[PDB]
Design an enzyme around this catalytic site. Sequence first.
Site, mmCIF file in Angstrom:
data_model
loop_
_atom_site.group_PDB
_atom_site.id
_atom_site.type_symbol
_atom_site.label_atom_id
_atom_site.label_comp_id
_atom_site.label_asym_id
_atom_site.label_seq_id
_atom_site.Cartn_x
_atom_site.Cartn_y
_atom_site.Cartn_z
ATOM 1 N N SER A 1 4.354 2.018 8.279
ATOM 2 C CA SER A 1 3.997 0.919 7.383
ATOM 3 C C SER A 1 5.159 0.492 6.534
ATOM 4 O O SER A 1 5.967 1.300 6.092
ATOM 5 C CB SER A 1 2.827 1.252 6.479
ATOM 6 O OG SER A 1 1.650 1.472 7.265
ATOM 7 N N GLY A 2 5.235 -0.820 6.320
ATOM 8 C CA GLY A 2 6.341 -1.426 5.596
ATOM 9 C C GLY A 2 7.503 -1.872 6.448
ATOM 10 O O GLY A 2 8.329 -2.659 6.000
ATOM 11 N N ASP B 1 1.346 1.180 19.848
ATOM 12 C CA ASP B 1 0.983 0.707 18.504
ATOM 13 C C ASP B 1 2.007 1.201 17.484
ATOM 14 O O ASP B 1 2.818 2.073 17.768
ATOM 15 C CB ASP B 1 -0.411 1.236 18.122
ATOM 16 C CG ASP B 1 -1.109 0.451 17.000
ATOM 17 O OD1 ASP B 1 -0.620 -0.613 16.545
ATOM 18 O OD2 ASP B 1 -2.197 0.931 16.564
ATOM 19 N N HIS C 1 0.810 -1.225 0.000
ATOM 20 C CA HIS C 1 0.000 0.000 0.000
ATOM 21 C C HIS C 1 0.837 1.266 0.000
ATOM 22 O O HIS C 1 0.340 2.340 -0.358
ATOM 23 C CB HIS C 1 -1.020 -0.005 1.138
ATOM 24 C CG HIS C 1 -0.495 0.497 2.447
ATOM 25 N ND1 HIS C 1 -0.230 -0.339 3.504
ATOM 26 C CD2 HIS C 1 -0.232 1.752 2.887
ATOM 27 C CE1 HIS C 1 0.165 0.371 4.542
ATOM 28 N NE2 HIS C 1 0.200 1.641 4.184
ATOM 29 N N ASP D 1 -0.720 -7.297 1.845
ATOM 30 C CA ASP D 1 -0.035 -6.018 1.908
ATOM 31 C C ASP D 1 1.475 -6.225 2.077
ATOM 32 O O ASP D 1 2.044 -6.079 3.162
ATOM 33 C CB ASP D 1 -0.607 -5.153 3.039
ATOM 34 C CG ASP D 1 -0.211 -3.708 2.938
ATOM 35 O OD1 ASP D 1 0.342 -3.271 1.911
ATOM 36 O OD2 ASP D 1 -0.479 -2.958 3.928
ATOM 37 N N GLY E 1 3.335 6.223 8.858
ATOM 38 C CA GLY E 1 4.744 6.493 8.752
ATOM 39 C C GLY E 1 5.584 5.258 9.049
ATOM 40 O O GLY E 1 6.720 5.219 8.628
HETATM 41 O O1 7Z7 Z 1 -4.145 5.564 0.286
HETATM 42 C C1 7Z7 Z 1 -3.016 5.975 0.213
HETATM 43 N N1 7Z7 Z 1 -2.003 5.131 -0.124
HETATM 44 C C2 7Z7 Z 1 -0.654 5.684 -0.199
HETATM 45 C C3 7Z7 Z 1 0.031 5.654 1.134
HETATM 46 C C4 7Z7 Z 1 1.411 5.701 1.131
HETATM 47 C C5 7Z7 Z 1 2.093 5.681 2.327
HETATM 48 C C6 7Z7 Z 1 1.441 5.605 3.527
HETATM 49 C C7 7Z7 Z 1 0.049 5.574 3.537
HETATM 50 N N2 7Z7 Z 1 -0.615 5.499 4.743
HETATM 51 N N3 7Z7 Z 1 -1.762 6.262 5.121
HETATM 52 C C8 7Z7 Z 1 -2.124 5.875 6.312
HETATM 53 C C9 7Z7 Z 1 -1.251 4.861 6.785
HETATM 54 C C10 7Z7 Z 1 -1.297 4.116 8.056
HETATM 55 C C11 7Z7 Z 1 -2.223 4.172 9.072
HETATM 56 C C12 7Z7 Z 1 -1.818 3.215 10.090
HETATM 57 C C13 7Z7 Z 1 -2.292 2.784 11.323
HETATM 58 N N4 7Z7 Z 1 -1.675 1.843 12.005
HETATM 59 C C14 7Z7 Z 1 -0.549 1.274 11.585
HETATM 60 C C15 7Z7 Z 1 0.003 1.637 10.377
HETATM 61 C C16 7Z7 Z 1 -0.634 2.603 9.604
HETATM 62 N N5 7Z7 Z 1 -0.356 3.161 8.402
HETATM 63 C C17 7Z7 Z 1 -0.335 4.667 5.760
HETATM 64 O O2 7Z7 Z 1 0.691 3.782 5.739
HETATM 65 C C18 7Z7 Z 1 -0.663 5.583 2.340
HETATM 66 C C19 7Z7 Z 1 -2.764 7.424 0.541
HETATM 67 O O3 7Z7 Z 1 -1.536 7.860 -0.051
HETATM 68 C C20 7Z7 Z 1 -3.944 8.249 0.023
HETATM 69 O O4 7Z7 Z 1 -3.470 9.495 -0.490
#
Ligand code: 7Z7
Lengths: 56, 247
Positions: free
Chosen positions: B186-187, B180, B41, B90, B184
């Site tokens: 993710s990955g 948690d 994602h 993912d 920022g």
């Molecule tokens: O939909 C999209 N995809 C791209 C894109 C890229 C990079 C990052 C994100 N991205 N947005 C939100 C979160 C995220 C929430 C969260 C809660 N708990 C644990 C881990 C979590 N991660 C996240 O990782 C999206 C957007 O960019 C929409 O503009």
Amino acid sequence: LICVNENGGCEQYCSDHTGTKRSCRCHEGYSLLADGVSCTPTVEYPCGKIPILEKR
Amino acid sequence: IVGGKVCPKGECPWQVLLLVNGAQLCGGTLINTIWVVSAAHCFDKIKNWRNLIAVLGEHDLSEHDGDEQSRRVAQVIIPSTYVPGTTNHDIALLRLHQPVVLTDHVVPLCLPERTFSERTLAFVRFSLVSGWGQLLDRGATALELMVLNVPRLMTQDCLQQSRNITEYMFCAGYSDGSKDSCKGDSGGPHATHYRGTWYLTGIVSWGGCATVGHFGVYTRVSQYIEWLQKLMRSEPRPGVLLRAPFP
Ligand SMILES: O=C(NCc1cccc(-n2ncc(-c3cc4cnccc4[nH]3)c2O)c1)[C@@H](O)CO
Ligand SMILES: [Ca+2]
Ligand SMILES: [Cl-]
């Protein structure tokens, strides 16, 4: 010794064989000791070890 | 990361920072000198696939100390089963344009065998999650790399204790709103210790940060070991994005 229970006694990876037979294996950058279970690094920066803690 | 601590410099040496036009995108995990595992994602909205950078040996984003190593991302490989804007499958495998150099500050995390991961690692209770993500829900991101110890739940227990989790995911963390992974992060890695060595068991997925009644959701890396290993034996293909059949 089966791989499902206590990891077959292996430090890392375990394969079951035909009979009451088991072989342990090690990731790249490690070698298996003569105990048949332990893995020792063969390179400076083996995976999954933290150099500053291994030196301390 | 909410409710963690600074990872002392060099103690999370597999952590990757992904940048797009110099801006923080996501985390990742180094598994070999040219291969990084991240979350699919992270790449849903990439316009220019040529401006993606992976940084190894990073710690404090405010300074340069000479241990950082930056590489262009040459390939982003995503399972065919991943649907943009969703949570299932993912995972992404990234090929770097040139290997990183292993050092005291840059070391791969071991990608385990599937059997070992399912039979042994899946029952280790606590594992570490790390990143430069938000320190609070609706808060600023971290300048120093943060790390958090989280307990893993069996999926039956996660569903019961929660005030859609597939076989390609697992829950870990806390339901009290204190601790948690967050946007920022993710990955980044969910790393599990077993008998002196650390292994990759999860990828920080999404997406509700330290929300009371909910746990963090992680991609279950054990489901993808064979997929990853086959791709790492394959030749690169022109064009950065590659969708690869899963299984
Ligand atoms: O939909 C999209 N995809 C791209 C894109 C890229 C990079 C990052 C994100 N991205 N947005 C939100 C979160 C995220 C929430 C969260 C809660 N708990 C644990 C881990 C979590 N991660 C996240 O990782 C999206 C957007 O960019 C929409 O503009
Ligand atoms: Ca720095
Ligand atoms: Cl490069």
